[PDB]
Design an enzyme around this catalytic site. Structure first.
Site, short mmCIF file in Angstrom:
data_model
loop_
_atom_site.label_atom_id
_atom_site.label_comp_id
_atom_site.label_asym_id
_atom_site.label_seq_id
_atom_site.Cartn_x
_atom_site.Cartn_y
_atom_site.Cartn_z
N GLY A 168 -9.77 -7.99 -7.27
CA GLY A 168 -8.67 -8.77 -6.68
C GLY A 168 -9.13 -9.69 -5.55
O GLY A 168 -10.20 -9.43 -4.98
N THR A 205 -6.34 -12.18 1.44
CA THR A 205 -5.88 -13.36 2.23
C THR A 205 -7.05 -13.96 3.03
O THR A 205 -7.04 -15.21 3.21
CB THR A 205 -4.69 -12.99 3.13
OG1 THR A 205 -4.64 -11.57 3.27
CG2 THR A 205 -3.37 -13.50 2.57
N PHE A 247 -12.91 4.47 -3.37
CA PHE A 247 -12.46 3.82 -4.64
C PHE A 247 -11.46 4.72 -5.37
O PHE A 247 -11.69 5.94 -5.45
CB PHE A 247 -13.63 3.51 -5.56
CG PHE A 247 -13.26 2.75 -6.81
CD1 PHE A 247 -12.99 1.39 -6.77
CD2 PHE A 247 -13.15 3.40 -8.04
CE1 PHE A 247 -12.63 0.70 -7.91
CE2 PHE A 247 -12.79 2.71 -9.18
CZ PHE A 247 -12.53 1.35 -9.12
N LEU A 248 -10.38 4.13 -5.90
CA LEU A 248 -9.44 4.75 -6.86
C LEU A 248 -9.16 3.75 -7.99
O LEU A 248 -9.30 2.53 -7.75
CB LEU A 248 -8.17 5.19 -6.13
CG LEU A 248 -8.38 6.29 -5.09
CD1 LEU A 248 -8.33 5.72 -3.68
CD2 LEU A 248 -7.35 7.40 -5.23
N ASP A 261 -3.34 1.58 -9.21
CA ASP A 261 -2.34 1.35 -8.14
C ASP A 261 -0.96 1.69 -8.70
O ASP A 261 -0.82 1.71 -9.94
CB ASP A 261 -2.38 -0.10 -7.65
CG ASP A 261 -1.94 -1.12 -8.70
OD1 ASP A 261 -0.75 -1.13 -9.02
OD2 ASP A 261 -2.79 -1.87 -9.20
N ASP A 301 2.68 -4.45 5.74
CA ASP A 301 2.78 -5.03 4.37
C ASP A 301 2.57 -3.93 3.32
O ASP A 301 1.79 -4.13 2.36
CB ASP A 301 1.79 -6.19 4.16
CG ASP A 301 2.04 -6.92 2.85
OD1 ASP A 301 3.23 -7.29 2.61
OD2 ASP A 301 1.08 -7.07 2.06
N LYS A 358 3.41 -2.09 0.15
CA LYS A 358 4.04 -2.48 -1.15
C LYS A 358 3.34 -1.71 -2.27
O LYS A 358 2.32 -1.08 -2.02
CB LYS A 358 4.00 -4.00 -1.28
CG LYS A 358 2.62 -4.62 -1.42
CD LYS A 358 2.51 -6.01 -0.80
CE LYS A 358 1.18 -6.67 -1.07
NZ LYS A 358 1.17 -8.07 -0.62
N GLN A 404 1.45 -2.45 -4.83
CA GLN A 404 0.08 -2.94 -5.16
C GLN A 404 -0.98 -2.13 -4.41
O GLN A 404 -2.08 -1.98 -4.97
CB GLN A 404 -0.14 -4.41 -4.80
CG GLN A 404 0.42 -5.41 -5.80
CD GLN A 404 1.73 -6.01 -5.32
OE1 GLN A 404 2.68 -5.29 -5.00
NE2 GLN A 404 1.77 -7.33 -5.26
N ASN A 405 -0.68 -1.66 -3.19
CA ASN A 405 -1.69 -1.00 -2.31
C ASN A 405 -1.29 0.46 -2.07
O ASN A 405 -1.55 0.97 -0.96
CB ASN A 405 -1.98 -1.82 -1.06
CG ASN A 405 -0.75 -2.26 -0.30
OD1 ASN A 405 0.01 -1.41 0.18
ND2 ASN A 405 -0.55 -3.56 -0.15
C1 LIG Z 1 -6.29 -1.53 -8.23
O1 LIG Z 1 -6.60 -1.76 -6.84
C2 LIG Z 1 -6.59 -3.07 -6.24
C3 LIG Z 1 -7.59 -4.03 -6.93
C4 LIG Z 1 -5.14 -3.64 -6.26
O2 LIG Z 1 -4.78 -4.25 -7.52
C5 LIG Z 1 -4.90 -4.69 -5.19
O3 LIG Z 1 -3.83 -5.26 -5.17
C6 LIG Z 1 -5.87 -4.97 -4.20
C7 LIG Z 1 -5.76 -6.22 -3.34
C8 LIG Z 1 -6.81 -4.04 -3.90
O4 LIG Z 1 -7.41 -4.17 -2.69
C9 LIG Z 1 -8.10 -3.25 -1.96
O5 LIG Z 1 -8.50 -3.71 -0.91
C10 LIG Z 1 -8.53 -1.88 -2.35
C11 LIG Z 1 -8.87 -0.89 -1.37
C12 LIG Z 1 -8.76 -1.07 0.12
C13 LIG Z 1 -9.31 0.36 -1.75
C14 LIG Z 1 -9.46 0.68 -3.09
O6 LIG Z 1 -9.89 1.92 -3.38
C15 LIG Z 1 -9.15 -0.26 -4.08
C16 LIG Z 1 -9.30 0.08 -5.54
C17 LIG Z 1 -8.72 -1.54 -3.70
O7 LIG Z 1 -8.39 -2.41 -4.67
C18 LIG Z 1 -7.04 -2.84 -4.78
#
Ligand SMILES: CO[C@@]1(C)[C@H](O)C(=O)C(C)=C2OC(=O)c3c(C)cc(O)c(C)c3O[C@@H]21
Length: 274
Positions: free
Chosen positions: A10, A13, A71-72, A75, A116, A118, A120-121
């Site tokens: 992804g 900003t 890492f996971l 979301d 923020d 939401k 997604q995070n």
């Molecule tokens: C599926 O996960 C995304 C790509 C997510 O679609 C998304 O919207 C953004 C912007 C991410 O941004 C992230 O910064 C993030 C962090 C801090 C930890 C993490 O384990 C992951 C896997 C991260 O990826 C995520």
């Protein structure tokens, strides 16, 4: 660098996000590459709780800023979109909400705000756990989860701005539909007013003195809550309405919400992720 970039997951900003491998540890990590803050950010490394994504390293080298996170794989937004036809089972909903509140309760007691927050995070796993990502860094983007005190131009947010967002996501998991899907600051703010009625000094002391409050706003009546989040039970609706109080000081604390009767029968079920 001791990081091997698998693939891009992804854009943010200030920087971009990569899935990466730490050449020392053989450790798979989420890696954020950005182009006083470094000191303020670094402090989040100390936050250790089961429902917070771990900030592992803040590297300031080659006059550039890399953040490395736990890492996971998935979301909540993907898991909602996948679970669209059938809907998330209420025991899994109830588990995620209870867990997210323990995370907020932990962050808030250390004076740490998301702002923020939401879907997604919010990251999930096969153990059936949910973790808060991008927490405490902030210090077009969707406004669907923005508290009404932010949209009315309050500079001095409190922990209640995050309870609001969680209440919006709770509604969305239950209904399979964004509660306030606004597409501008006024549209967003008017969508909240169409559901909870236009606020006033009665229900929200101070509201007429907010920076961007207009006396020229329309006066909408409040909608009954059984029409907004059916078929959520009376405990769920009760907890939701305390999370969506206009007055941030009347808005329920994460701590207080964990003791709500809605969590009397709470369990930890395990989802099918692809
Ligand atoms: C599926 O996960 C995304 C790509 C997510 O679609 C998304 O919207 C953004 C912007 C991410 O941004 C992230 O910064 C993030 C962090 C801090 C930890 C993490 O384990 C992951 C896997 C991260 O990826 C995520």
């Amino acid at each position: 660098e001791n990081f091997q970039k698998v693939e891009k997951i992804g854009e943010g900003t200030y920087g971009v996000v990569y899935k990466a491998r730490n050449k020392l540890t053989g450790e798979v990590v989420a890696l954020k590459k950005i182009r006083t803050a470094i000191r303020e950010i670094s402090l989040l490394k100390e936050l250790n709780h089961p429902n917070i994504v771990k900030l592992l390293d803040v590297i300031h080298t080659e006059n550039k800023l890399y953040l490395v996170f736990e890492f996971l794989h998935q979301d909540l937004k993907k898991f909602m979109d996948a679970s669209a036809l059938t809907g998330i089972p209420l025991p899994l909903i109830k588990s995620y909400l209870f867990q997210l509140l323990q995370g907020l309760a932990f962050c808030h007691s250390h004076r740490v705000l998301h702002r923020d927050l939401k879907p997604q995070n919010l990251l999930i796993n096969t153990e059936g756990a949910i973790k808060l990502a991008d927490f405490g860094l902030a210090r077009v983007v969707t406004l669907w989860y923005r508290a009404p005190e932010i949209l009315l131009g309050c500079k001095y947010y409190s922990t209640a701005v995050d309870i609001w967002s969680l209440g919006c996501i709770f509604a969305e998991m239950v209904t399979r539909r964004a509660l306030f899907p606004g597409d501008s600051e006024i549209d967003q703010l008017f969508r909240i007013f169409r559901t909870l009625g236009t606020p006033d000094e009665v229900v929200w002391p101070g509201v007429t003195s907010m920076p961007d409050y207009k006396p020229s706003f329309p006066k909408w009546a409040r909608q009954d809550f059984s029409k907004v989040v059916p078929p959520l039970d009376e405990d769920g609706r009760s907890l939701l309405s305390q999370m969506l109080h206009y007055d941030p000081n009347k808005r329920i604390s994460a701590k207080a919400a964990l003791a709500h009767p809605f969590f009397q029968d709470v369990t930890k079920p395990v989802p099918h992720l692809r």
